[PDB]
């Protein structure tokens, strides 16, 4: 029952880079590690076996590396095909285990998020319940924060966001946040705001809309 | 010098008819006689000729305590291990060469010879150890693996491994996976008579 | 060409039964061992399973011991994982791979993998509504629009833009589970300003667990 610590947990580099990812096992394995990689809605591919041993029909920039009890991926250069998610796991003793997860993200300069604000639909409000939405889209890096303003009150525990993977040619991720709640309780307020806080902004940008108006 | 012209039996180890297992390498100790070491490179047709210590061009001149040439096989990328200070299953658990090693080492590929429609299963490499092997040992011991923190009692199954595995020769493998067989030429040079030389 | 697929997959209720299948092709199960990994959404992977064809010695995971039953068919050369007293927290996508011995080696060979879902919750058509460009939308930027898809138990939906005319500037959310203990999810594409009036634009949501097709198109609200 063997645990496999990976670091790091999230990777920002650029194409072209040589990068480094590693697994400490808790006890020894001998040479028992295999490292997969793993992009969105996919199964895992497996790269290395044996702790360093290369995979038929994989690139030969991936190497791997056993230091004692410390087992090391390496990638000699970054290709943008090697986006994705990689993994550890051990066939020593069972139950096997893999590890926690190592996500590489391609590197990009700051960009602020386009936002926008969209009222709930009249249909909606037919059946009884109304879904404000706040979208903000293209900004890097992934963090970001979406606070919902009622009236100059926050609004706690009735907002649910989702965010988009990496985009194929953008390279910037994208947020949504839903803030559902029933009619009788919108209709009782009148202004409806989404104020968003970003690393590439002066200020916390504040769109908004009222209750009533188009 | 050996006052004694005795060709040395090189043929008997290059043209062996079938080599060993890696983990279970052979070793021929080779003296009292002589030997021309450059015709060897000039043959040309091995494709790793890598040499440790001292020049490969035309080194017969040098004479020798003695020598030990060492033959087994493994698969292509795995002669980049064949070398001093390198690491992996084979140079951890299989066959170690020292640090001051003083040798050359040669290696070509023999597909033709050591594959098998269906594949090869004779050759064999350890895949388990406790501890890594100090430089030219070699262990030849089968007995069970256990890796969990209950016995194994001899029997296989999870985590209670065999410790060795074969390879899996196959005739359409990639070259990274075809056999290789390999020779390791080791100059034991001491203070006692010099019982291998040069031509002439 | 090797090759292994899933099967069997579905939706339960807590505490049903579910069996996954494995049929693997251009190899034989003898000397190999096959193995179940699953992979809750957006979490790491876990090991569940596994079993050695050939002697048919089998090893199981803490987590599901007792509950799961991995068995193996060496004339069918296909692998099963009988799984009974399901839970919630099953709930993921279940892959099947097969290593060499029974350990020390990888897992050459993934299955595309199959979903099971483990919810009180009935499987529900997607109410989908529309999420108009603002009004007050610069002219010189683009406004943005989009649907949004909500109150949908099985999660497998699709969503189009105009037949598959609109692959640029669009952005699909993943799902996100509600208190309710359905799905509910959003897609929005940018356009230029101008061709707001011109252009129609029609969001196309296929639900198939439930079988429901159906198309909405945005406008503006105008009042
Ligand atoms: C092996 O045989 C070939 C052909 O007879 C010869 O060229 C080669 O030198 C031999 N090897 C040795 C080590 O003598």
Redesign the interface.
Same mark, same amino acid.
């Given at each position: 029952?063997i645990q496999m610590t990976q670091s790091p947990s999230s990777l920002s580099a650029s194409v072209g880079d040589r990068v480094t990812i590693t697994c400490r096992a808790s006890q020894?394995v001998? *040479?028992?590690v295999?490292w997969?990689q793993?992009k969105p809605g996919?199964?895992?591919?497996?790269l290395?076996?044996?702790? #360093?041993?290369? /995979? *038929?029909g994989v690139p030969s920039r991936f190497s791997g590396? !056993?230091?004692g009890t410390d087992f090391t991926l390496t990638i000699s250069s970054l290709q943008p095909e090697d986006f994705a998610t990689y993994?550890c796991?051990q *066939? /020593? !003793? /069972?139950?096997?285990?893999?590890?926690?997860?190592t996500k590489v993200e391609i590197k990009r300069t700051v960009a602020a998020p386009?936002v926008?604000?969209?009222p709930?639909?009249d249909?909606?409000l037919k059946?009884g319940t109304a #879904?404000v939405?706040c979208?903000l889209?293209?900004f890097y890096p992934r963090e970001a924060k979406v606070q919902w303003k009622v009236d100059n009150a926050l609004q706690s525990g009735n907002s649910?966001?989702?965010?988009?993977e990496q985009?194929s040619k953008d390279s910037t991720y994208?947020?949504?946040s839903?803030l559902?709640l029933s009619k009788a309780d919108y209709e009782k307020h009148k202004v409806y705001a989404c104020e968003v806080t970003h690393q590439g902004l002066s200020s916390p940008v504040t769109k908004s809309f009222n209750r009533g108006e188009? | 010098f050996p006052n004694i012209t005795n060709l040395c039996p090189f043929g008997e180890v290059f043209n062996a008819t079938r080599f060993a297992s890696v983990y279970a390498w052979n070793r021929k100790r080779i003296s009292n006689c002589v030997a021309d070491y450059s015709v060897l490179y000039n043959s040309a047709s091995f494709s790793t000729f890598k040499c440790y210590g001292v020049s490969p061009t035309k080194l017969n001149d040098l004479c020798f305590t003695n020598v030990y040439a060492d033959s087994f096989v493994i698969r292509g990328?795995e002669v980049r291990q064949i070398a001093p200070g390198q690491?992996?299953?084979i140079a951890?658990?299989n066959y170690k060469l020292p640090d001051d090693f003083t040798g050359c080492v040669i290696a070509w590929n023999s597909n033709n010879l050591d594959s098998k429609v269906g594949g090869n299963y004779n050759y064999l490499y350890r895949?388990?150890?406790?501890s890594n092997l100090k430089p030219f040992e070699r262990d030849i011991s089968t007995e069970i693996y256990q890796?969990?923190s209950t016995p194994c009692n001899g029997v296989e199954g999870?985590?209670c491994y065999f410790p060795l595995q074969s390879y899996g020769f196959q005739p359409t493998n990639?070259v990274?996976?075809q056999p290789y067989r390999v020779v390791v030429l080791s100059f034991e040079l001491l203070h006692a008579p010099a019982t291998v030389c040069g031509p002439k | 060409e090797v090759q292994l697929v899933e099967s069997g997959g579905g939706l339960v209720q807590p505490g049903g039964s579910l069996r996954l299948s494995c049929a693997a092709s251009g190899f034989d199960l003898g000397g190999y061992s096959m193995?179940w990994?699953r992979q809750a959404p957006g979490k790491?992977?876990? &090991?569940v399973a =596994?079993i050695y064809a050939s002697g048919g010695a089998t090893?199981?995971?803490?987590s599901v011991k007792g509950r799961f039953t991995i068995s193996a068919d060496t004339s069918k050369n296909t692998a099963y994982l009988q799984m009974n007293s399901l839970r919630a927290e099953d709930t993921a996508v279940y892959?099947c791979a097969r290593?060499y011995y029974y =350990?020390? %080696? =990888?897992?050459?060979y &993934?299955?595309? =993998?199959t979903l099971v879902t483990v919810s009180s919750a009935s499987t529900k058509g997607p109410?989908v %509504?529309?999420?108009?460009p603002?009004?007050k939308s610069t002219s010189g930027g683009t406004?943005?629009l989009?649907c949004?898809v909500?109150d949908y138990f099985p999660e497998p939906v699709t969503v189009s833009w105009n037949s598959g005319a609109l692959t640029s500037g669009v952005?699909? %959310?993943?799902?996100?589970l509600?208190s309710s203990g359905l799905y509910?999810?959003?897609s929005?594409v940018?356009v230029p300003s101008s061709s707001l009036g011109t252009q129609t634009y029609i969001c196309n949501v296929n639900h198939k667990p439930s079988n429901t097709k159906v198309d909405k198109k945005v406008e503006p609200?105008?009042?």
């Open positions: 029952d020894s001998s *040479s028992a295999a997969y793993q996919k199964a895992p591919k497996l290395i076996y044996s702790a #360093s041993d290369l /995979y *038929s590396s !056993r230091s993994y796991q *066939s /020593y !003793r /069972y139950p096997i285990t893999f590890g926690q997860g386009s926008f604000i969209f709930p639909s249909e909606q059946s #879904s939405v979208l889209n293209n649910q966001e989702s965010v988009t985009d994208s947020l949504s839903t559902t188009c | 990328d690491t992996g299953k951890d658990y895949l388990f150890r406790k890796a969990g999870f985590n990639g990274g996976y | 193995h990994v790491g992977l876990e &090991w =596994g090893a199981y995971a803490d892959y290593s =350990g020390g %080696f =990888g897992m050459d &993934w299955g595309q =993998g109410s %509504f529309p999420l108009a603002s009004s406004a943005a989009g949004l909500k952005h699909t %959310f993943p799902a996100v509600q509910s999810l959003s929005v940018t609200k105008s009042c």
